């Protein structure tokens, strides 16, 4: 449920590199990349959410934070750290 | 047995959507049929799916087990749905 | 009854994020998202109306306004504020 | 009892539409029947629904209570209709 | 009176299309019906519309005036059609 | 002759789908009819097709040969189906 | 005459796509209709086009000449298609 | 009838600003904006035509030209000036 | 039957150039190009499958691999190489 | 048929200036420019192909080469010279 509130503060490109950089199939993101080259509207949570369906079992939040930092961000995981914190 | 599969179909039908066809194929459902299904219910994505499942239950009268359903869901990455399908099957 | 006149001024995407962002099941909106990727014709009120059936009891207008602002809009609730006002 | 259910069917029939089938299932109406109903009245969405309800009243002669009807409506999110169905039942 | 509304329906039916439903609502046509209409004539957009209008003429036997029709068209911005509808009504 | 065409119709009917109409045209089936066929069986894509084929068999009592059927299938790129249709015709 | 136009429709239908509507307008096809056509066949782009052409053939029983068809294609820059349409008309 | 031949020389974005900038409801253009973020095919005349239904009475061509210039173009009205001229 | 599982890892554009670049008629792909400018959902296998009906006789897999490399990819044939391999 | 294989080696911008610089209507290219400011995927052949429909009669290849050089390139016509050559 945070996957939505998170995209909020994120960006269509950071998050971009995020998921693709987390074993979410590169081919799937290619659809979602061209699916809207200029749309960060919902586009954000869409990418984020697909990854969600990827793991979702145990300690998924860790993978979202840790991985968010390993995907050349170290900035998106920070605003989400404030949401789960909250 | 029978109502178990019903309860599972309800969680799946109201939750898949988009990659339904992916799911169809996993349930070893010929596209010869999948084609038709797109045809018959162009309207609701929810119906199409269910139908999909139905064909699957008629393909294996006796081996139509939720087990396999969850197995089908997880090979397509629909984890969250196989999960819910599993927790509704444990509660029952 | 305002759910119709409201969609009027709204957009298929804002309203999009609205409902989905108001406990209207994300799965339901997915049907209504693909049900017309390019149709803001009726598409607007359809989404808005489903949420209506969601609450509809007491002080629903508040939830429409307050929630509309919490769903990263702070703009749709403004034109509707003018309609109920009216 | 009898005219109460009538008044309720009238509010429901003229108000559901689209997700009628969702409603059918909630009223524990086999699709074996739901199929047929789509069949018999391909024309009016209003008839199909009603019919749906009818089968439901014949399934439980004695436990066919508006209570459950409203209960069926709200599990499917048709709040506004269960509401109206409830205010017409209170006025009567 | 009767043939006047006929001539107007013909211009409207063959000219609205896309935002027909917008029009339906303006003619104070319940969606409970609009739903059905989408249903009955999934095929032709032209039929659906007309039908829409028909229901409207049956809702007000006596106050079914082209006046209001043009009034309905213009509140939805279908100016060009209310215009034509007005020039065919003046010529007759 | 007669059962040969039957066996072929069964493979085709349960396998074409989508571009059925393309196929119809190749079998030199007037759209005047193709229109109707869409009409009569809006429900199943499988029926429509078959029907399509039927009309074709009635158009040429004597020259209704699987040969031509496969010929029709391959001009439309439905190779995989003309293939199967050919291997079921060789096995028989 | 009749089969000539058929052969041409087949090359056009399976080759235009995208700017079909541009083509429709060139064939002096009212949008009142073009609207409808978008409506009736939301599914296949190929059908819509053809249909488009059909209306055009019914608009001019006698002057429905491939000449004009090619003329319509080239005013919209669909050169490559008017070309093919011209080489299939010369071969016949 | 020129609304079609005009879009021809126009662009999905100029024309964009055009209509929206001519009392054609901003909400309507939002549908037609997302209805095809990358399609100038028919997309052009669609926008142009909606405005047509907007006025269409008397001296509409003037509004198309004058307005086209007031909508930060001063370039689209020029190629159309050649079509009606013709 | 692999045509489905293959599109999976592929992209609507690579595969795009693939088929069109394999004697699958350019006109057919134009329908399938506009049939969904932003949809890699099924769109992938649709293109791939049409080519399938194109050959399908003997050694078709070779044409899928070899051709996939000759269609300026040299990357799509690799993930499929892993599927038939498997 | 080379229009596809050619775009391959080309660029969304060179080719850009190409077509627009060959009597392919500037307005048409404006749609195709904004139609994807950042997409050289198919974007290449799309522009190239529209020009194709422009001439296509006799000695079109000459116009593609000669014109490619007159459109401030003198570099795109070189890699295509190798393709038709081939």
How many angstroms separate the CA atoms of B86 and G30, rounded? 57
Residue ranges of alpha helices (H) inside J1-86 are 2-9, 14-20, 26-34, 43-54, 60-70, 76-85
Contacts of E39 in chain D (CB under 8 A): 44-45
Domain carrying residue D38: 2-91
- Chain E: list its partners (3+ Cβ pairs within 8 Å): C, D, G, H
Helix (H) or strand (E) holding F22: helix F20-26
In which residue are the tokens 């596209």 written? B31
CB contact under 8 A, G17 and I34: yes
Q: Is-contact D14 D81, C-beta < 8 A? A: no
Close Cβ partners of B85 (under 8 Å, ≥ 6 residues apart): B8, B11, B12, B66, B69, B70, B73
Going by C-alpha positions, the residue among G85, G88, G92, G90 that lies closest to residue G53 is G85
- Tally the domains of chain G: 1
Question: Residue C57 gets which letter from DSSP?
Answer: S
> How far is the CA of I22 from the CAs of I25, I52, I68, in angstroms?
8, 11, 9
Contacts of B87 in chain A (CB under 8 A): none
| Chain J interface, Cβ < 8 Å to G | 50, 52-57
- Here the tokens at position H59 are 């001296």
CB contact under 8 A, H41 and J31: yes
The domains of chain A, with CATH numbers, are 2-81 (1.10.533.10)
Question: Residue D65 gets which letter from DSSP?
Answer: -
For residue G32, with 0-12 CB atoms within 10 Å meaning exposed, 13-18 middle and 19 or more buried, which class applies? middle
Of J5, J8, J41, the CB nearest to I13: J41
How many angstroms separate the CA atoms of F85 and F73, rounded? 9
Query: Distance (Å) from the C-alpha of residue A67 to the closest C-alpha of chain H?
Result: 32
- Chain D: list its partners (3+ Cβ pairs within 8 Å): B, C, E
Measured CA angle at I3 (ends I2, I8), to 5 deg: 90
Q: Is-contact A3 A49, C-beta < 8 A? A: yes
Q: Is-contact I12 I39, C-beta < 8 A? A: yes
CA D67 to chain centre: 12
Contacts of B77 in chain A (CB under 8 A): 53-54
DSSP string, chain E: -HHHHHHHHHHHHTT--TTHHHHHHHTT--HHHHHHHHHH-SS-HHHHHHHHHHHHHHH-TTT--HHHHHHHHHHTT-HHHHHHHHHHHHH-
- Here the tokens at position F86 are 């050919």
- Here the tokens at position A69 are 């930092």
Q: Which value, to the nearest 10 degrees, does the dihedral of the CA atoms of residues H7, H12, H17, H18 take?
A: 0
| Length of chain F measured in residues | 92
Q: Is-contact C9 C44, C-beta < 8 A? A: no
CA H5 to chain centre: 11
CB contact under 8 A, A55 and B80: no
CB contact under 8 A, C25 and D77: yes
How many angstroms separate the CA atoms of J86 and J80, rounded? 9
Contacts of F77 in chain I (CB under 8 A): 50, 53-54
Close Cβ partners of J13 (under 8 Å, ≥ 6 residues apart): none
For residue J86, with 0-12 CB atoms within 10 Å meaning exposed, 13-18 middle and 19 or more buried, which class applies? exposed
How many angstroms separate the CA atoms of G13 and G85, rounded? 11
How many angstroms separate the CA atoms of B24 and B76, rounded? 10
Going by C-alpha positions, the residue among G71, G73, G90, G83 that lies closest to residue G19 is G73
How many angstroms separate the CA atoms of F53 and F64, rounded? 10
Helix (H) or strand (E) holding A46: helix A43-54
CB contact under 8 A, A54 and B78: no
- Here the tokens at position I67 are 């051709």
DSSP string, E45-71: HHHHHHHHHHHHHHH-TTT--HHHHHH
The CB-based long-range contact list for C30-39 (8 Å cut-off, 24+ gap) reads C30/B17, C30/B18, C30/B45, C31/B17, C31/B44, C31/B45, C31/B46, C34/B17, C34/B18, C34/B45, C35/B45, C36/C12, C37/I38, C38/H31, C38/H34, C38/H35, C38/H36, C39/C12, C39/H31, C39/H35
Going by C-alpha positions, the residue among I39, I38, I71, I55 that lies closest to residue I3 is I55
Surface of F (1-60) touching B: CB under 8 A: 14-18, 43-46
Question: Residue B16 gets which letter from DSSP?
Answer: -
CATH of the domain at G26: 1.10.533.10
Note the resolution in Å, 1 decimal: 6.8
SS (H, E, C) chain G: CHHHHHHHHHHHHCCCCCCHHHHHHHCCCCHHHHHHHHHHCCCCHHHHHHHHHHHHHHHCCCCCCHHHHHHHHHHCCCHHHHHHHHHHHHHC
> How far is the CA of H64 from the CAs of B27, F65, H40, J66, in angstroms?
58, 63, 19, 40
How many angstroms separate the CA atoms of E35 and E52, rounded? 11
Method: X-ray
Q: Is-contact E8 E88, C-beta < 8 A? A: yes
């Amino acid at each position: 449920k945070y996957i939505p509130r998170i995209a909020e503060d994120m960006t269509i490109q950071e998050a971009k590199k995020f998921a693709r950089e987390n074993n979410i199939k590169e081919g799937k993101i290619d659809e979602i990349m061209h699916d809207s080259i200029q749309d960060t509207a919902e586009q954000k949570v869409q990418l984020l959410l697909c990854w969600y369906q990827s793991h979702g079992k145990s300690d998924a939040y860790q993978d979202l934070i840790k991985g968010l930092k390993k995907a050349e961000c170290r900035r998106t995981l920070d605003k989400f750290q404030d949401m789960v914190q909250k | 047995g029978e109502e178990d599969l019903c309860a599972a179909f309800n969680v799946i039908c109201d939750n898949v959507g988009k990659d339904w066809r992916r799911l169809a194929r996993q349930l070893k459902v010929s596209d010869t049929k999948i084609d038709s299904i797109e045809d018959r219910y162009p309207r609701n994505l929810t119906e199409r799916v269910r139908e999909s499942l139905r064909i699957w239950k008629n393909t294996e009268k006796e081996n139509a087990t939720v087990a396999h359903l969850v197995g089908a869901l997880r090979s397509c990455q629909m984890n969250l749905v196989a999960d819910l399908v599993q927790e509704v099957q444990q509660a029952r």
